[PDB]
Design a protein around this nucleic acid. Structure first.
Ligand code: MG
Ligand code: MG
Ligand code: MG
Ligand code: MG
Ligand code: MG
Ligand code: MG
Ligand code: MG
Ligand code: MG
Ligand code: MG
Ligand code: MG
Ligand code: MG
Ligand code: MG
Ligand code: MG
Ligand code: MG
Ligand code: MG
Ligand code: MG
Ligand code: MG
Ligand code: MG
Ligand code: MG
Ligand code: ZN
Lengths: 103, 39, 71, 74, 135, 213, 81
RNA sequence: UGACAGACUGAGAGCUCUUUCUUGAUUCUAUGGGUGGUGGUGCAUGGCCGUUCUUAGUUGGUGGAGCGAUUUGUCUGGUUAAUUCCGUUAACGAACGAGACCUCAGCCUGCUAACUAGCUAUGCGGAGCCAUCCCUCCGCAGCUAGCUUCUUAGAGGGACUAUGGCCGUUUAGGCCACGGAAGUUUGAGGCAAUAACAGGUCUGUCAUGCCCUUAGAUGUUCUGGGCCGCACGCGCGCUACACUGAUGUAUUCAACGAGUAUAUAGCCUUGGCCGACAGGCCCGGGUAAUCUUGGGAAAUUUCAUCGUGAUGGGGAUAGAUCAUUGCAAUUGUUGGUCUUCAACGAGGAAUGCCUAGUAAGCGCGAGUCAUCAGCUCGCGUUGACUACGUCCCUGCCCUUUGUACACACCG
């Protein structure tokens, strides 16, 4: 009746992610569930360095572009329906919710 | 045999991460895609 | 070069005028007091404004001073 | 762990020194840790305080933090 | 044990062990192979195989599950490309495989499930015995 | 199965392509933005413009067409992708809509300075801290020149430029060449969020008046 | 352009059911999706209906978006319907 | 309209011809009109970028002065990295730029946590040993943690020149010092004004005016060649001229990143076997803090061999031969094996970059990419000499001054 449910969240924005991440944890704290989280995984910075000029004249100057991607994990023990009851609240834009079942 | 998705040009192509844009179209659309100039 | 600019100096004097009684000569307590009366957008701005108010109080407690009008 | 051979040696140095200071702090005595602190910190202040020095990033226009590409006029 | 002895004198002591301790086979190319693509000459010492064995059984004794494509990186090094910049090159897999196979054919190490190579209980035993005898 | 890096890059590329599409159709419609919100089983794409009737069209035939072709190009699961039409809260505080307005006045034949001061005054009367309109090209002559029209407060360096400035660039294909329009608008501090940014300027102070008892 | 009557028939039926169409610019793609044709004709008969304002075109930056027009639906009904 | 056999052809292009089947209003013919063009013109333009310009600079309103262009404000002086500030004051009050701001790095045994990070203890397993326990070193598993120090990433805290001394209107500030993780704005970046340039870009853009062409094409596509050719001059560089070294053992310490259904094993590739290398076959993991990868890097350290010799320094030029990528490797793609052993004895006049984890040395990653990195953009590792000034040279800012210059002394 109790599984091992892992919910993984990804985002480009720290705060919009952490709002939802805290909301899930507290929504599963009212049900006296075992919430082992949130676990923080190394920020992935996607980087592309590009020449500013379109024509290759002048000083060679570069601009470094970066996307920060953040990876949170929440652990739960429940049935998938109780969690689906919990992970049904209003989700901020840009947040990925990808609940699965670990072994 | 590999062109910019935005303009179909053959030079200065960015295939990293799956973008497949040329170095000028990527600059024009970098902010829209989500690439921020931090440092 | 640690010259304080216009914003800090102006805000320092203008907060000395409004509350002379609730400020004091310690930096840290003055930091807290300045956090309890005004809305600033950076910790560094607060530390700088409080640092300029603390020796302004030291010289006020010393003698007279320019434009600030203490009641 | 980490760093290189010299950096690991200096890290170990700091490890013995601060570990001894903490042991005399928490288990032996507050006065005989002040003793050992003074012997350690009269010889070298960086058996207890680490170096904030890091490797400065590299900037385009040269291969190095400060160096630049050699300039030619004609 | 092995970590209480300097790893240079220990490898000298062990590579003298396998010599006068019975024998093993030795290929018919030991005198001609360079041990690395980037090397210039074969190993200078005629007794290098045993050195390479004694140095190498200490790798498995301090680690667990090391393949051959990891030993090639262990014994690889700097390759100079003449007028181009030098880079990192890996050594030859044939000697690396052959010494492990021989250690198997003496019972010092053994192949490991989950991949790799692991020191045997008896192989641990003689390594600490010889370690006990190094100044 | 797709990694996170490639997932997010594709999401950003989709939004870029979608917007650079939707600025071609909703041109004489006041197009002013697109937002892709992802719900379970559905992906909402709120188009926003100044004239929602025009994008909607007659009984929503245009929005139907847009939904259908957006579905078909970007291989969405059928009926999974839908479009809506919200309307910009303030037309006079968006430089995309304002630049397009100025563009259409110019291509109508309206004299340049009249149109630029019209845009300027409208942005100032809608409660903006300041406005800047740049018009560049061959104006009446073979040599290219540029005119700048400014009003109110205007800042150009530092971080708040990103959150306090709304800027838009638009070409004009007036006869005998090309005109460039740059529109810059300084928004004002709105803790509510409806009209401006919430965080104040990095150099702004507020001493609460010394209440007495 | 020389296209078989069957190929144009399928272009018009697909232009009917939904009313909208897209190609890419890749010339000689040799199999359009959603309908069976080498993707050259599709572009080249939308190039006709655009000239007769049966369809309104957005170049979409060289990638060909087509929407059927109230004027051209009446023509195409008398053709396959 | 499509097509057989020979010629035509490089061609298995029905391109063209011999032959007449196949196909049906989609086409053909002329006029018009569109269309395409990495065609022209950046001195017709847009946008972008560079530079003037790394400095501190720029501008209204109202008032003052002047016939006026113009000027003041925007300043004598002190001070600052700063048109920063104090203050002076026909100006007063403001707008940009500087600063603030944002990113990264530096401190936190304080908070929140973490089996995709680990440390600790305990258990079992091995190995040593005064041996039976104890002791040391590893393996392994959990309802061990009053676990989160180390790792990760969030919320905050912390520095303000705060305190002291001395100089200074004893103002703004400056130097010194205890403390402290930190006292050049803590270091390094991002962002960045007015006005301008006939700066570069029509060869990024189905961005664009005009012109040219538009079928016997400057359109598109195919095949082959060139872009790489070599008496010579120039610019950025790579390798070196050796013993503070080369070679051969042993030994072994990082960080930043990367891994498209990549076809039926496929991008990064562990593991096993064959092979001297190159490379190959098989069983597999990973869409990734999980697998590659604790990224087992080099310089460095260590013990030998060389012995002042164009030498075992150097590795150019070249022969033979193997393998790999790719549809194809020829004017050698690249990687291997043996052989060949050039100049080069620290470089004339000139000239560049550099003030601390910096220069320099060392290697690693990514971009390009089927294959190719001597490049560029990042990253760690080892880690100094000198200075803490000046306006001599090259320039820059402000003031006063002269001017027959204003395309402005390249007058
Ligand atoms: Mg070297
Ligand atoms: Mg062409
Ligand atoms: Mg120009
Ligand atoms: Mg230009
Ligand atoms: Mg005036
Ligand atoms: Mg006046
Ligand atoms: Mg007058
Ligand atoms: Mg700074
Ligand atoms: Mg252009
Ligand atoms: Mg060709
Ligand atoms: Mg260069
Ligand atoms: Mg040599
Ligand atoms: Mg060596
Ligand atoms: Mg090539
Ligand atoms: Mg590469
Ligand atoms: Mg290059
Ligand atoms: Mg004179
Ligand atoms: Mg004159
Ligand atoms: Mg002269
Ligand atoms: Zn492009």
């Amino acid at each position: 009746v109790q599984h091992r449910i892992r919910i993984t969240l990804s985002s480009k924005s720290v705060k919009n992610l952490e709002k939802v991440c805290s909301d899930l944890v507290k929504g599963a704290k009212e049900k006296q569930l075992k919430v082992k989280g949130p676990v923080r995984m190394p920020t992935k910075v996607l980087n592309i360095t590009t020449r500013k000029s379109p024509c290759g004249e002048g000083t060679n100057t570069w601009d470094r572009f970066e996307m920060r991607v953040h990876k949170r994990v929440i652990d739960l023990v429940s049935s998938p329906d109780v969690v689906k009851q919990i992970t049904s609240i209003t989700i901020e834009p840009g947040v990925e919710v990808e609940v699965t079942i670990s072994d | 045999s590999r062109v910019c998705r935005v303009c179909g040009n053959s030079h200065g192509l960015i295939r990293k991460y799956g973008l497949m844009c040329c170095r000028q179209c990527f600059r024009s659309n970098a902010k829209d895609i989500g690439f921020i100039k931090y440092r | 070069g640690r010259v304080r600019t216009k914003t800090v100096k102006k805000t320092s004097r203008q907060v000395i005028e409004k509350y002379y009684s609730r400020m004091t000569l310690d930096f840290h307590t003055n930091k807290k007091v300045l956090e309890e009366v005004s809305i600033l957008q950076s910790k560094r701005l607060r530390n700088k404004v409080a640092g300029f108010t603390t020796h302004l109080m030291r010289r006020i407690q010393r003698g007279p001073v320019r434009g600030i009008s203490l009641k | 762990r980490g760093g290189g051979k010299t950096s690991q040696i200096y890290s170990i140095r700091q490890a013995i020194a601060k570990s001894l200071v903490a042991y005399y702090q928490k288990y032996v005595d507050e006065a005989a840790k002040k003793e050992v602190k003074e012997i350690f910190a009269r010889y070298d202040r960086t058996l207890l305080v680490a170096d904030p020095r890091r490797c400065e990033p590299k900037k385009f226009g040269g291969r190095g933090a400060r160096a630049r590409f050699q300039k030619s006029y004609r | 044990t092995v970590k209480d002895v300097n790893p240079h004198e220990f490898v000298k002591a062990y590579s003298a062990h396998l010599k006068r301790s019975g024998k093993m086979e030795l290929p018919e190319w030991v005198d001609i192979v360079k041990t690395a693509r980037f090397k210039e000459l074969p190993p200078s010492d005629a007794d290098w195989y045993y050195i390479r064995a004694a140095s190498m059984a200490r790798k498995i004794y301090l680690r667990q599950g090391i393949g051959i494509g990891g030993f090639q990186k262990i014994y690889g090094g700097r390759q100079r490309n003449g007028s181009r910049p030098p880079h990192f090159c890996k050594s030859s897999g044939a000697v690396s495989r052959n010494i492990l196979q021989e250690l198997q054919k003496m019972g010092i190490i053994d192949v490991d499930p989950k991949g790799g190579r692991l020191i045997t209980s008896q192989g641990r035993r003689d390594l600490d015995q010889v370690a006990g005898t190094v100044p | 199965q797709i990694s996170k890096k490639k997932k997010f890059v594709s999401d950003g590329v989709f939004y870029a392509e979608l917007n650079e599409m939707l600025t071609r159709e909703l041109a004489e419609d006041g197009y002013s933005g697109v937002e892709v919100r992802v719900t379970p089983m559905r992906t909402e794409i709120i188009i926003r413009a100044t004239r929602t009737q025009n994008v909607l069209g007659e009984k929503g035939r245009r929005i139907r067409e847009l939904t259908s072709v957006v579905q078909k190009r970007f291989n969405f699961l059928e009926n999974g992708v839908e479009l809506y039409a919200e309307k910009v809260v303030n037309r006079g505080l968006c430089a995309i809509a304002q630049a397009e307005s100025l563009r259409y006045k110019l291509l109508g034949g309206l004299a340049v300075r009249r149109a630029c001061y019209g845009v300027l005054r409208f942005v100032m009367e809608s409660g903006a801290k300041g406005c800047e309109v740049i018009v560049s090209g061959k104006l009446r002559a073979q040599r290219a020149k540029s005119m700048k029209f400014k009003d109110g407060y205007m800042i150009s360096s530092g971080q708040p430029v990103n959150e306090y400035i709304d800027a838009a660039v638009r070409h004009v294909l007036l006869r005998q060449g090309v005109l460039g329009i740059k529109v810059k608008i300084m928004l004002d501090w709105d803790p509510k969020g409806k009209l401006g940014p919430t965080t104040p300027l990095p150099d702004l102070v507020t001493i609460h008046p010394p209440k007495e008892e | 352009m020389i296209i078989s009557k069957k190929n144009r028939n399928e272009i018009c039926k697909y232009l009917f059911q939904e009313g909208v169409l897209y190609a890419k610019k890749d010339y000689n793609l040799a199999k359009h999706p959603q309908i069976d044709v080498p993707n050259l004709q599709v572009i080249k008969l939308m190039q006709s209906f655009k000239s007769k304002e049966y369809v309104r075109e957005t170049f979409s930056w060289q990638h060909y978006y087509w929407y059927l027009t109230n004027d051209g639906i009446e023509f195409l009904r008398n053709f396959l319907n």
